[PDB]
Ligand binder design. Structure first.
Ligand SMILES: Cc1cc2nc3c(=O)[nH]c(=O)nc-3n(C[C@H](O)[C@H](O)[C@H](O)COP(=O)(O)OP(=O)(O)OC[C@H]3O[C@@H](n4cnc5c(N)ncnc54)[C@H](O)[C@@H]3O)c2cc1C
Length: 456
C-alpha cells in the first residue's frame, strides 16, 4: 500500500477505517450470508458522498478489488471481498421526506425499516422488500419488490433520480432528464455503474392494511396452490397473496402436532380500504382449512416488519430462483414433492405472484428483466450448522433442476455466489448489450465487478 495515496485518502476520508488488526474487523466484515467468509484488506465506513468519492478514488489508484456494502444482504455475498476494500455505506442511513411533495430522499446505506419509518411518519410509503433489515441499496438497484409492488410497481418504478459516484471519482445526478442512459441502467443493473449515495422516490398514501397469514396442511397443497394460481391471474392489483412452503414454526396459533412439519404459509394483504380488504381476503383464505389464522389491520410499517413468522435470522443460506410464465398442475406437484423434503426450520420455498403494476411497465423502460413473467419461485435454503451446508444446498439445487422445465430468467437479487454465469440469461440479449454500452461509458475498467457483473 503506497503511503502518499493512503495518506491523502486519510486527509479526505472523514469516516472510519477498519483494519485487519482492529478488534471490530471480524464483525465489520460479516455479511448476512454467513457462508461467505472473506478477509478484506480494508473496511471504509463512509459518512457522506465526499467520503465515498475518496474511497472510490483510493481504490482506483491503489488497484484494490472493490466491494460496496449497503445493507449487506447479498445472497451471492458480493458486499465483502477477499483482500480488497469495502466501501461500507451503513452509516449513511438518513432520509428526508416531504409530506407535501410526496418525496423521499434516502442515502445509499439505508435499511428498509428506517426508510419505511420515515415515510410512515406521514402515512406515506413506496414499495420495497419484505424484511425490514435488508438494505435499500442493493435491493433498489436490482428492481426491488414486495407488498406494495402489485399496486405501485417495483422500487425502481418509483425512483425519480439518483446521486451516484462513478468509477472515475466523479459525482453525477442521473434522472429521466439528466444522464438518462445511466438512469436506465441503475434501475435494474445493480451496482455495476457506480455507488449510489442518494435515491429519490415518489411516495404514496398507504393507510392501514388488512392483512392475513395462515397455514395449510400439505396434503391440501394441490387445491391451495391451484386456487392461488387461478385467482391471481385475474386478481385486482390491490390483492397481494404469497405462499411459503416451510416447516411450521412452533407458534401458539398452530397446533403442536403441526410444529416442525412441512406446510404452506399463505400471507395475504389488501392495499386499500380495510373493509373491502376483509371481503377480499375471506374469498382467498379458505381454499383449504386455515390453521393458525392471524388477521389484523396493520399500519403499513407494521406489515413491513412482520416477515417472517418465527422472527429467526439464519446464519447460512443458499438460494436458487427463477421466474415462471405458467404454473402447471405438474409443476405444482413438483413443488409439493420437494417441499415435503424440507429439512431446516428456516428454509422456505417461496412462491410469489408479481404482475400487476410491475407488468404494465413496458419491457424496455428500465433494465429490470422478466416483467411479463408473473411467478417467482425462490428455493431459499437457510440453516445454522456450518457442517450441514451440503444437505441444504442439495435441496435447493435438486429442487431447482426438477423445475428447470418451467423456470426462465432470474432476479439478480436472488442469485447465489456460484451463479455468475446466469447473468446473460437473466437480463436477456437486448438488455445485456445495452447495459454493456452504459458499462463502457461509465465503468470501462470494471472497477465495480462485485455484483451480478456486466463487463463493459
Ligand atoms: C432476508 C432477505 C429478504 C429479502 N427480501 C427481498 C424482497 O422481498 N424483495 C426483493 O426484491 N429482494 C429481497 N431481498 C434481496 C435484496 O433485494 C438483495 O439481496 C439486495 O441486494 C440487498 O441489498 P443490500 O444492500 O442489503 O445488500 P449488499 O450485500 O449490501 O449489496 C448488494 C449488491 O448491491 C450493491 N450495492 C448495495 N448498495 C449499493 C449502493 N448504494 N450503490 C451501489 N451499489 C450498491 C453491492 O455492491 C452488491 O453488489 C432479500 C434479501 C434478504 C437477505
Amino acid at each position: 500500500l503506497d503511503p502518499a495515496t493512503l495518506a491523502a485518502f486519510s486527509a479526505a476520508f472523514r469516516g472510519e477505517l477498519i483494519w485487519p488488526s482492529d478488534a471490530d474487523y471480524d464483525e465489520a466484515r460479516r455479511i448476512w450470508n454467513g457462508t461467505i467468509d472473506r478477509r478484506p484488506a480494508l473496511i471504509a465506513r463512509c459518512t457522506s458522498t465526499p467520503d465515498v468519492v475518496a474511497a472510490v478514488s483510493f481504490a482506483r489508484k491503489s488497484g484494490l478489488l472493490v466491494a460496496v456494502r449497503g445493507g449487506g444482504h447479498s445472497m451471492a455475498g458480493h458486499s465483502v471481498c477477499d483482500g480488497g476494500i469495502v466501501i461500507d455505506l451503513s452509516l449513511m442511513n438518513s432520509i428526508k421526506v416531504s409530506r407535501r411533495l410526496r418525496r423521499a430522499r434516502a442515502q445509499g446505506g439505508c435499511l428498509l425499516g428506517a426508510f419505511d419509518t420515515a415515510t410512515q411518519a406521514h402515512m406515506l410509503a413506496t414499495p420495497a422488500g419484505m424484511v425490514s433489515h435488508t438494505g435499500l441499496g442493493g435491493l433498489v438497484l436490482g428492481g426491488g419488490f414486495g407488498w406494495l409492488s402489485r399496486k405501485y410497481g417495483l422500487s425502481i418504478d418509483n425512483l425519480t433520480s439518483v446521486e451516484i459516484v462513478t468509477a472515475d471519482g466523479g459525482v453525477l445526478t442521473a434522472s429521466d432528464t439528466e444522464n438518462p442512459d445511466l438512469f436506465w441502467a441503475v434501475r435494474g443493473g445493480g451496482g455495476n455503474f457506480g455507488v449510489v449515495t442518494a435515491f429519490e422516490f415518489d411516495l404514496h398514501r398507504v393507510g392501514p392494511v388488512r392483512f392475513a397469514s395462515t397455514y395449510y396442511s400439505l396434503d391440501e397443497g394441490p387445491q391451495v396452490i391451484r386456487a392461488w394460481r387461478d385467482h391471481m391471474a385475474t386478481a385486482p392489483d390491490e390483492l397481494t397473496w404469497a405462499l411459503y412452503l416451510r416447516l411450521a414454526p412452533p407458534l401458539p396459533e398452530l397446533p403442536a402436532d403441526m410444529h416442525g412439519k412441512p406446510v404452506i404459509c399463505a400471507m395475504s394483504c389488501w392495499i386499500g380500504d380495510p373493509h373491502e380488504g376483509e371481503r377480499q381476503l375471506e374469498s382467498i383464505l379458505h381454499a383449504g382449512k386455515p390453521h393458525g389464522l392471524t388477521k389484523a389491520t396493520l399500519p403499513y410499517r407494521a406489515l413491513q416488519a412482520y416477515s417472517f413468522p418465527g422472527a429467526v435470522v439464519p446464519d447460512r443460506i443458499y438460494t436458487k430462483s427463477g421466474y415462471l410464465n405458467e404454473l402447471s398442475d405438474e409443476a405444482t406437484d413438483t413443488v409439493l414433492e420437494h417441499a415435503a423434503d424440507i429439512a431446516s426450520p428456516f428454509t422456505q420455498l417461496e412462491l410469489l405472484y408479481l404482475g400487476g403494476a410491475v407488468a404494465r411497465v413496458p419491457d424496455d423502460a428500465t433494465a429490470y428483466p422478466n416483467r411479463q413473467s408473473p411467478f417467482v419461485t425462490n428455493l431459499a435454503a437457510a440453516w445454522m450448522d456450518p457442517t450441514e451446508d451440503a444437505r441444504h444446498t442439495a435441496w435447493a439445487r435438486e429442487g431447482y433442476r426438477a423445475l428447470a422445465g418451467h423456470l426462465s430468467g432470474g432476479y439478480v437479487n436472488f442469485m447465489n455466489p456460484g451463479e455468475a454465469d446466469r447473468t446473460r440469461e437473466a437480463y436477456g440479449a437486448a438488455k445485456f448489450e445495452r447495459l454493456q454500452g452504459v458499462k463502457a461509458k461509465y465503468d470501462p475498467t470494471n472497477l465495480f465487478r462485485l455484483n451480478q457483473n456486466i463487463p463493459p
